[model samples]
Target: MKTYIKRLNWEESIYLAINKLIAKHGKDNEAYNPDNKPFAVFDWDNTSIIGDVEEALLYYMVRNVSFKMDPEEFYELIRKNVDRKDYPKEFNNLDKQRVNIDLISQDIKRAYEKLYKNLDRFEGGKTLEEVQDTDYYQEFVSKMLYRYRASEFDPEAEDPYCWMSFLLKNYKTEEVYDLCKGAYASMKKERIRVEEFVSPDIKSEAGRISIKYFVGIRTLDEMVDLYRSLEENGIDCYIVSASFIDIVRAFATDTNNNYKMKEEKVLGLRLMKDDEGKILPKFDKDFPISIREGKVQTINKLIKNDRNYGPIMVGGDSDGDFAMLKEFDHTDLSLIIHRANSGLIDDLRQKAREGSLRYYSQGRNLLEASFVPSNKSEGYNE
Candidate 1:
């Protein structure tokens, strides 16, 4: 039997180029070698899926009030690894006041204290949905979501990527898997939309900051098909994401998800565990951070020797995937999930335009939840 990429929304030249590569290197070729079969690496978040699972999990966690720690510990968990300073001027509340990180954090701490004491953690605890419209719920979500977004803009100084996992501080590994699975199932059915979350005016000087998030996630049919086609042709597929490794694995390796990757085949940021095996807030120093240059480190450290000297193909969607996309010399094609171009990736796209690098792109629309015909075309809200 022959294996081939099925007809989809790929750019015409890219479609032809991939078919040619498969023909030369596919297992059906007489010269193919089982011992030295080539492999491909993909970035998980936007590359394999239509949205970020990490963000979706956070959204789910907040709404569900997912946590297992006492107030002091929970309070410390939120502030740990965060800078004790003012947020950037861009983060203004509804009143257009710039926020101080400490004040906003204190507000969150108070809300959590109340929630832990009476609302959700006690004998007669109330469900979050029952009190969803209360000022307490609104404040906790607004401040927490703001904290998440602020962490992204200044990750170098704050290391909020690690903080994302840190937010899951008291959970055992299995609990995390359960939480992530629930998040994936919930977000998968949501329609893509930007949502504004606002808090009640209380103590923080910013007075109820406003935050926005894209409220849905989806698995890309195009990427799922690509993985199947490559595996059918004897190429192994691996996902190296910047997301927390377990969170990515919980989705990528789920029996229901067509990606069907192995747990070991997916790599990303890892957290250390306590003596009883609860996840710690700290990152595993032994593993690479798995973003930008760290992406290259993960491959060289984890995938190089066994799977030939380097990957023959790479797929990615943003700056986190940039280093791996350029590091390996043997790559036949670097697939870009065309979102937007800036900084180092802009140069890579220029090469794709000039035909010097074997780069190809596919377009997607978040709102429509589908791939588009042209890479250069704008997305739904662009």
Candidate 2:
């Protein structure tokens, strides 16, 4: 087998640069050390996949109304646990009215009970299709969507990265994994697009809100191939993501998805477990949360350990992965899957432009469903 990977659709510069790094550090190389094998760490969400797997799972769960909690528990989870304040000014309803979690949670709880009661079809309850047509369904979905969007834009809001695991509460890790894997399959078969869901029109405190969700998900063929090629050349590959651990495990480790990463090779947000091994909605305080600078900490505490050197390659797409991308002085290459994002990534691109950093930005074409070697960004134009 070739010691280095080639023939990829990656920009020629990046492809060749990667091959050079792999050839030098590959397990077959004379410079390779038995005690310190070269490895690459990747950010999972947009770095390895085109869209957010975690958010996609949220969409799936909400669409199915698959809750383990009863009305009271659901209400408490959102009311007591989540922030009760109104969302950011930018997240207001179409009428420019502010909405708070308190009102949304109550409405959601009422709708959830209505939907849950009808889910028991053996007792002559409504079918899923039948339930979907109800105003309560619209209320429940819109409220959930609002909360998810709020968390993204507001720092004071509950962190969806962690809260998703909580919302997925009472399930064994395996069950969540299975559910996520199923969601991936169902989502991938659909075409990528934006979907707008509007809340029911009614005289309520939470008022009506319209949210646009990015639909469809797919693994980045280039990234999957990159992982395989790295392993083939004897470089270990690992994912240190900000997503819930089991959620990443489902899509990344599944044989059907083609990444086929081992669970041990992946790290992400983790939740505490109950005595019966069912995961709770709480973050495990023992581990670093693995976002931004925390990703640097996770690599040091876990992946790097006491090793004197850092990863040979690193890949990421957003600000969350920025710290690790810039922290490691030992990395031979740092790749950014450019999506036209602003902030820190724009800074990275500037550094790459000036040849001050070993950064390479690759652009993606959604219509072509391919990666192009360049500092140009795409996919978020909408």
Candidate 3:
């Protein structure tokens, strides 16, 4: 495992808290057991691993589209559209508006068709600018890239943009990449323009890149062991993420030596398929529940019937996770993984303190490398 020099301030706190909790409840006690475990809600994205799906999708888009443009030019285009504040004026001017949902959907379908039709010529590190210049490419980019609202939901407020802005402010480039790769692969496959060969390559690349990037940041082996240990101890383990259910299952199965994480334990956004066999993702459901606040809905839905499970333990990072943490405010524990150099730590800590939450950090450990040993004590110690 790669050693990350940065030491988070809260590692000891996390281990201490977990140790205390396990001791108080007894690791094998059904009350606190993780197998048959009542609830173990984990924030996807940075909390469980490194990388963000949104950034990954954008990276794929920029790379594929920029195939023709030089690095400088391609980056400029990305920067220009990154904020997407002026999308209405830039791409969907009144003059370009299609009549109804059907027409709009049809146009989108055609745009994708054109895209895949020329995938090979555009691959091999081509930039977005190069793709933009191709026939009907501008329409495709505007429709699929700029118009889509690709952010997680917020429970505190009704306006979706507010939460989206929160996500944009928190995520770094790499996090975004890890989170979006699967979705991007799925989208690429659905597009009418991409050739059959492109789909497999996208899936292969996403898996390889995600594993390489996440290994050092999160101890997947340890996490799996922890889950298994919990099960052995009579604690039920559940997998909750913001990723699409299908994608999460596929990835988890591949990672867990072909043993699928039980479907009931895996909670995620669902996709809507049309009669024509095209997938129209219910964006809210299709994305992972990792954005923090969105997790409550997923968890509440997951554990609605099991009143026997007393107190919940929610783990997360970022403002998006505040909602999830809050849900367990009255519970026994709520952990925030404030690894070293995480810009969101201060704000999250402040929120936790304000809410009277039991905050714990990974204490200078990289997210992937940090794991509270089962035997350790719980709670923070300065």
Candidate 4:
């Protein structure tokens, strides 16, 4: 556990340099201080939450597979197919043998109805193990039928019902409601073309599979909590992720009631629609997909109003967060969380030593560069 703070060089000087610009120009300067208040930007996954959403999606998918097959057999199959192009053949074949779109769709509807009927029992109220044991848990098991359908027939149109939408629609069980929700979710995936690339090989398909299984269920509470904390500080929090906007919005709404945050603060990657009104995600400039440094870029673009700019703080973990971390370093305070198990701290230290940037590590409170308040009075007062 080591933490060190050092100086920044030219290429990496943007953060401190920007802060200097703000100081010289004053908080009133539109070019430097857009909001005239302190601002904080956060990386959605792994930074504030415990697990990666994409990874969680994959975990859920694996569980779904286990529920459908012998756990040992399915695990071996996935292991054997980790990097094979025909990896999906076995799963697709299994899907054809045991399931179909109509059956899966009906199961999805029934699952939604069962969950809705027992919303209180599952909505942020059940552990993964607990949820698996509930009487209505079979609905969840049935809902998993969508994954095979997604893999076999329409991967893009696969499982559209997110926990957030389930919560938003008030846990009501209606055929049209399930259809619309499922269709919207599935359509968004189709627009993204997530299915076109799925091969038997796990490494190639891992990223998408991870996202599908993990993102929504695991971190809903933490995300809601972070939003609430930011709102309490009078800051407007938003959800900016590479994940589809509708999906993001649905998840955010699902967890909203658990916290005091508002809905309008959430935003996602927007897709462009065709002339025929078919929609596709805008992976280019217009939508400003929130990935890597795109998070900072999007924020800067969105908060054009002078009043919306101020001393900025950005928090994240991993290479994708580098850009945002670099941008935030320009401010008086820039923080990055390096996991105890990962090499992130060393990576940051090496970057600092190489004159890339200045950074501090927070590890079990043993590191010197860890956050220490300038004044104890403010702490007690608060």
Using TM-score as the measure, which candidate wins?
1
Clashes of 4: 21
Which is the winner by TM-score between candidate 2 and candidate 3?
Answer: 2
Candidate 4, position 106, lDDT: 40
Q: Tens digit of lDDT per residue, candidate 2, span 1-382? A: 3425545568767887887888788866897875776778999987898778877888888888766787788777655355556778887887998877776777778888788777763232777788888898888887887777774322454443425657877889878877876788888887787788899887666788888887777877778888998888777889999888988888899878889998999999878899999877677879988988999989988887543346889999888988988888789899988775678777887787777448988777654456766566555432
Give the poorly placed runs of model 2, Cα more than 4 Å off: 1-3, 121-124, 152-162, 305-309, 379-382
lDDT of 4 by residue, 1-382 (tens): 1111122221224334334433443433344433454555666545544344333333343233112222232323222212222334334432244333333334334444444444443333444565455544543343343343243322342232222211111122232233333433333232211222222211111211111222222333333544454444444555555554544444445432253334465555554445644332223246565766676777778643567653255555566666666664334434454443334335654564354434533221111212222211111110
User: In candidate 2, which residue pairs clash?
Assistant: 166-281
How much lDDT does each candidate structure score? 0.78, 0.78, 0.42, 0.39
User: On a 0 to 1 TM-score scale, where does candidate 2 land against the true structure?
Assistant: 0.92
State the TM-score for model 3. 0.51
Per-residue accuracy of model 1 over 137-196 as CA lDDT, tens digit each: 788888888887774323554354425667888788788888877778888877788898
lDDT of 1 at 13: 73
What would the TM-scores of all predictions be?
0.93, 0.92, 0.51, 0.43
In angstroms, give how far residue 162 of model 1 lies from its true place: 5.3
| Residue-level error in angstroms, candidate 1, position 117 | 2.2
